[PDB]
Design a protein around this ligand. Structure first.
Ligand SMILES: *[C@@H]1O[C@H](CO)[C@@H](O[C@@H]2O[C@H](CO)[C@@H](O)[C@H](O)[C@H]2NC(C)=O)[C@H](O)[C@H]1NC(C)=O
Ligand SMILES: *[C@@H]1O[C@H](CO)[C@@H](O[C@@H]2O[C@H](CO)[C@@H](O)[C@H](O)[C@H]2NC(C)=O)[C@H](O)[C@H]1NC(C)=O
Ligand SMILES: *[C@@H]1O[C@H](CO)[C@@H](O[C@@H]2O[C@H](CO)[C@@H](O)[C@H](O)[C@H]2NC(C)=O)[C@H](O)[C@H]1NC(C)=O
Ligand SMILES: *[C@@H]1O[C@H](CO)[C@@H](O[C@@H]2O[C@H](CO)[C@@H](O)[C@H](O)[C@H]2NC(C)=O)[C@H](O)[C@H]1NC(C)=O
Ligand SMILES: *[C@@H]1O[C@H](CO)[C@@H](O[C@@H]2O[C@H](CO)[C@@H](O)[C@H](O)[C@H]2NC(C)=O)[C@H](O)[C@H]1NC(C)=O
Ligand SMILES: *[C@@H]1O[C@H](CO)[C@@H](O[C@@H]2O[C@H](CO)[C@@H](O)[C@H](O)[C@H]2NC(C)=O)[C@H](O)[C@H]1NC(C)=O
Ligand SMILES: *[C@@H]1O[C@H](CO)[C@@H](O[C@@H]2O[C@H](CO)[C@@H](O)[C@H](O)[C@H]2NC(C)=O)[C@H](O)[C@H]1NC(C)=O
Ligand SMILES: *[C@@H]1O[C@H](CO)[C@@H](O[C@@H]2O[C@H](CO)[C@@H](O)[C@H](O)[C@H]2NC(C)=O)[C@H](O)[C@H]1NC(C)=O
Ligand SMILES: *[C@@H]1O[C@H](CO)[C@@H](O[C@@H]2O[C@H](CO)[C@@H](O)[C@H](O)[C@H]2NC(C)=O)[C@H](O)[C@H]1NC(C)=O
Ligand code: NAG
Ligand code: NAG
Ligand code: NAG
Lengths: 162, 204, 424
């Protein structure tokens, strides 16, 4: 099952089918008219749903991964086709990751290229220094897992019981 | 905040639930219940059905043990990291950047948590920075003076020497500077006086 | 095989070797950070378009959910690895428009405005040197997911880290970015490894020339060696090879009459077709579980490498490290991050002592019945005169009371020599 597009491949007269590097069919010769066709399988994609909490809203957006938008508030990304979110030229922090630099947030659901950080230009010069005149005592938290749940399995009882 | 510990508890519970759920899988046999297979078929075919259930359940158990081993390796790496943080951040002061918090690390406090540890990193963060005009060395009496522990700063008209991480201007003297060479080699040297502590003493 | 060249060190009880010169050495460290994010449609891979196969596959339980969940965990883990390694600054720092840093040239590591990709010459070389397979992998229900951070944004993060480390030194990593002249920053780094500021200031042009030469040698070395980028290419090779093997396993009979499900349906009755489809399902499921297991093991290895890369970025780039061999061979001065496909390359700028000279050494100097010990240096003798010098560079100075401290008399220290101590 697949689309049959035009092929630029020049087959030799004795060859009938075509195979990929990984032994999957990629071409065929038509037996009625001696022309070459590029067998390409039909589109498939991983449907992913982008949603905020149900506490806030029930609007959702759908991402078809790897699918061009013409083969399915529709925006085309390198990740795939995003339906239900409107592209905004503004850049904000990443709220819901979409991929290829695109992130989504709820404000309706918007999709944008995420900003890496606030832009700061340091005033570098050959004879100027910046010296701190005060300090802040900052306490920060670091959470590290140490152990897991200790599990034992009775092989005979699990597989066979009584 | 506590997503890592809850995540570990979730993975362990989910793995046990999946392993328990896999007992209700036929695995290509007529039934998932062994008692039904014994009560319904003769030993020549019951042996085959029990074999199908055994191979499916054994594959499920091996899969569970394999993911348990991989998670055990991940938790062992995290525990080794936690032990290193406990040794270097709590039992001493660490000069490793970002290992014991953001900022210049001062000290750390351990707190027990379910299946884990929470480190309270007390760090020193510089703030309220001010611009100053700086020079590499001070030229006095044909000699180049360099700071022993600080940096030369100027507020516009006067030169002082201060510690690098806090602004505390002090008069440039021979006590806090050292002389190495003349003034002809250092690029950017400025002319300023260097006070002598002994000068009022012998003068009076 | 020979282990190394044989060197016998001339150990004696009163001789020391003091360096009289130095070499600014820049070395490369290549670390993998992330892998290819892969997702597998369990139903499409095992059964394709066959409804009967899916019905028989449903009897096996939640194997498909486990494999999808594990792959999703690996896929989010790769993005977390990239965030941990590169997204360590929340301010995007920029270099001043006049690229003068006291003689130091950073053209090979700063972004090139001429290139559309906004990458450095070294980063561009790294991307060039790391390279219908993808279509077939896609056609068998396996999908590659794009990285969350694009190459240009990773390059932007490296640019921000370079701008912070060049214009502000290590201040930006510990709080607000405080501007400092680059010679003064390099003098601070020289003080970190135990060398006085005067050595850097007096030899500023030589140090700048050595650094520029080393950076040029690094670019030539990367461009001229095929096995330089073996780790990243190895990771790409393992991921592609694993996907190719998993795709190739669909052509395995697994003890059945045919490897094609359509043929099995078109040729046999349901009582025996169910058995043949079962054989294909168990073989393909075993192949997929094997692939997921090796993906998890490789994910653990890449996670360890990414944690190491994040530690190197924090301790070598955002500060000066006193750990031996962690940030290059030699006394570590500073480090520069460069983005690479699925990885990071650290340019470690280190100080290597050179041109060492023998001197006669003593533990203490006996003057006026008192023992004098060096405050920060070592006592050396060139044959007739005694001087005190810093340990890592030869700079002889007169032994005075300013640079020595008195502790005890001359009767306890073994090896004390008699010499005058000048009084200012
Ligand atoms: C030190 O002085 C420089 C320049 O005199 C200051 O940098 C300026 O900062 C403002 C506010 O962000 C910008 O609008 C200017 O464009 C900057 N100028 C340059 C040349 O970069 C800097 O803020 C001063 N530092 C402090 C602590 O006040
Ligand atoms: C250094 O910063 C501290 C706060 O971090 C300043 O203390 C504040 O002083 C103001 C006015 O003097 C008070 O209104 C605040 O309540 C103080 N805060 C705290 C937490 O005590 C201190 O004045 C600053 N010092 C300098 C020299 O700027
Ligand atoms: C730089 O700092 C010095 C020392 O604090 C300042 O000199 C003093 O300035 C105050 C007020 O201007 C006077 O009352 C003192 O008599 C000054 N002391 C001396 C020894 O002259 C100097 O004014 C500061 N410069 C600037 C531009 O602020
Ligand atoms: C620092 O002081 C030295 C000596 O007082 C200055 O050097 C003199 O500069 C003048 C004018 O440039 C020359 O005519 C003299 O021949 C120089 N003497 C020596 C011994 O070099 C120097 O210019 C001063 N620097 C600054 C920035 O004021
Ligand atoms: C310091 O002196 C020692 C001995 O005076 C030198 O060691 C000699 O090195 C040469 C060249 O490799 C060897 O052939 C000798 O056998 C060594 N002698 C001993 C006793 O080991 C050493 O090279 C000198 N250091 C410098 C920097 O010149
Ligand atoms: C320290 O080593 C540097 C090189 O690492 C020396 O600089 C060289 O000097 C020679 C002759 O003076 C020149 O021919 C070279 O071109 C210089 N090389 C570079 C890279 O500049 C320097 O002379 C040495 N210093 C001492 C005191 O030995
Ligand atoms: C910094 O280094 C770059 C390259 O290492 C220098 O650019 C070279 O300039 C010379 C003379 O203009 C050319 O012959 C080379 O082809 C250039 N190389 C490249 C890669 O463009 C640059 O001149 C150095 N100095 C400054 C101030 O940027
Ligand atoms: C050890 O170093 C000292 C100081 O550099 C040398 O003493 C000087 O030597 C030169 C040339 O031999 C003379 O022109 C100076 O007059 C000497 N200065 C003093 C204060 O005596 C000494 O010669 C060196 N010893 C050896 C063996 O090289
Ligand atoms: C260093 O100086 C001390 C004192 O000037 C020397 O000690 C004397 O040594 C002579 C001969 O060995 C004895 O006769 C004296 O009784 C010693 N006096 C004291 C107070 O101990 C010592 O020998 C000198 N060391 C060297 C290596 O020359
Ligand atoms: C197949 O038959 C059609 C109809 O006569 C003819 O036009 C075409 O050229 C034939 N193809 C071959 C390969 O003979
Ligand atoms: C000091 O910096 C400015 C720009 O920051 C530059 O134009 C000037 O050439 C530098 N000074 C020297 C002596 O190179
Ligand atoms: C000093 O070293 C030599 C050999 O290196 C040894 O023979 C001598 O005994 C040593 N000096 C003392 C006081 O032990």
């Amino acid at each position: 099952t697949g689309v049959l597009t035009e092929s630029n491949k020049k087959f030799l007269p004795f060859q009938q089918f075509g195979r990929d590097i990984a032994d999957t069919t990629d071409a065929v010769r038509d037996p009625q008219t001696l022309e070459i066709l590029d067998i390409t399988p039909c589109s498939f994609g991983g449907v992913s749903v982008i949603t905020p909490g149900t506490n806030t809203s029930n609007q959702v957006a759908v991402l078809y991964q790897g699918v061009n938008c013409t083969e399915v508030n529709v925006f085309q990304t390198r990740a795939g086709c995003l339906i239900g979110a409107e592209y905004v030229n503004n850049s904000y922090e990443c709220d819901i990751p979409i991929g290829a630099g695109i992130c989504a947030s709820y404000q309706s659901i918007i999709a944008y290229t995420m900003s890496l950080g606030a832009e700061n230009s340091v005033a570098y010069s050959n004879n100027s220094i910046a010296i701190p005149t005060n300090f802040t005592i900052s306490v920060t938290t670091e959470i590290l897992p140490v152990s897991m749940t200790k599990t034992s399995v009775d092989c005979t009882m699990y597989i066979c019981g009584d | 905040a506590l997503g890592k510990l809850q995540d570990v508890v979730n993975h362990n519970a989910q793995a046990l639930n999946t392993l328990v759920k896999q007992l209700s899988s036929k695995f290509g046999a007529i039934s998932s219940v062994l008692n039904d297979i014994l009560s319904r078929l003769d030993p020549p075919e019951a042996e085959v059905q029990i074999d199908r259930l055994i191979t499916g359940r054994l594959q499920s158990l091996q899969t569970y043990v394999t993911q348990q081993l991989i998670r055990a390796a991940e938790i062992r790496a995290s525990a080794n990291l936690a032990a290193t943080k406990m040794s270097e951040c709590v039992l001493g002061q660490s000069k490793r950047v970002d290992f014991c918090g953001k900022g210049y690390h001062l000290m750390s406090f351990p707190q027990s948590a379910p299946h884990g540890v929470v480190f309270l990193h007390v760090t020193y963060v510089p703030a309220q920075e001010k611009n100053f005009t700086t020079a590499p060395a001070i030229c006095h009496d044909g000699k180049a003076h360099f700071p022993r522990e600080g940096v030369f700063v100027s507020n516009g008209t006067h030169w002082f020497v201060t510690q690098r991480n806090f602004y505390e201007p002090q008069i440039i003297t021979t006590d806090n500077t050292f002389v190495s060479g003349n003034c002809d080699v250092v690029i950017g040297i400025v002319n300023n006086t260097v006070y002598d502590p002994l000068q009022p003493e012998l003068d009076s | 095989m020979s282990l190394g060249a044989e060197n016998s060190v001339a150990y004696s009880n009163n001789s020391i070797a003091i360096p009289t010169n130095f070499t600014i050495s820049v070395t490369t460290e290549i670390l993998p950070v992330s892998m290819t994010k892969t997702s597998v449609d369990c139903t499409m891979y095992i059964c394709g378009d066959s409804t009967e196969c899916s019905n028989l596959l449903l009897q096996y339980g939640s194997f498909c959910t486990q494999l999808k969940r594990a792959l999703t965990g690996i896929a989010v883990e790769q993005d977390k690895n990239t965030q941990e390694v590169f997204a360590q600054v929340k301010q995007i720092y920029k270099t001043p428009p006049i690229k003068y840093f006291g003689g130091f040239n950073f053209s090979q590591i700063l972004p090139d405005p001429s290139k559309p990709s906004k990458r450095s010459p070294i980063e561009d070389l790294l991307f060039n040197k790391v390279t219908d397979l993808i279509c077939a992998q896609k056609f068998n229900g396996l999908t590659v997911l794009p990285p969350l951070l694009t190459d240009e944004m990773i390059a932007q993060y490296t640019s921000a880290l370079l701008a912070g480390t060049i214009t502000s030194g290590w201040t930006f990593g510990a709080g607000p970015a405080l501007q400092i002249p680059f010679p003064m920053q390099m003098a601070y780094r020289f003080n970190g490894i135990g060398v006085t500021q005067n050595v850097l200031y007096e030899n500023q042009k030589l140090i700048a020339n050595q650094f520029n030469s080393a950076i040029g040698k690094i670019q030539d070395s990367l461009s001229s060696t095929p096995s330089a980028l073996g780790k990243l290419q190895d990771v790409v090779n393992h991921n592609a090879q694993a996907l190719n093997t998993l795709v190739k396993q669909l052509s395995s009979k697994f003890g059945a009459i045919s490897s094609v499900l359509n043929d099995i349906l078109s040729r046999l009755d349901p009582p025996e077709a169910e058995v043949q489809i079962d054989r294909l399902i168990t073989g393909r499921l075993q192949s997929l579980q094997t692939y997921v297991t090796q993906q998890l093991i490789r994910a653990a290895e890449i996670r360890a490498s990414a944690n190491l890369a994040a530690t190197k970025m924090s301790e070598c780039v955002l500060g000066q490290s006193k750990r031996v061999d962690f940030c290059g061979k030699g006394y570590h001065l500073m480090s520069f991050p460069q983005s690479a496909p699925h990885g990071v390359v650290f340019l470690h700028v280190t100080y290597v002592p050179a041109q060492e000279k023998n001197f006669t050494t003593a533990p203490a100097i006996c003057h006026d019945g008192k023992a004098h010990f060096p405050r920060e240096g070592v006592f050396v003798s060139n044959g007739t005169h005694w001087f005190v010098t810093q340990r890592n560079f030869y700079e002889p100075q007169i032994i005075t009371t300013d640079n020595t401290f008195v502790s005890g008399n001359c009767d306890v220290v073994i090896g004390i020599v008699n010499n005058t101590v000048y009084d200012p």
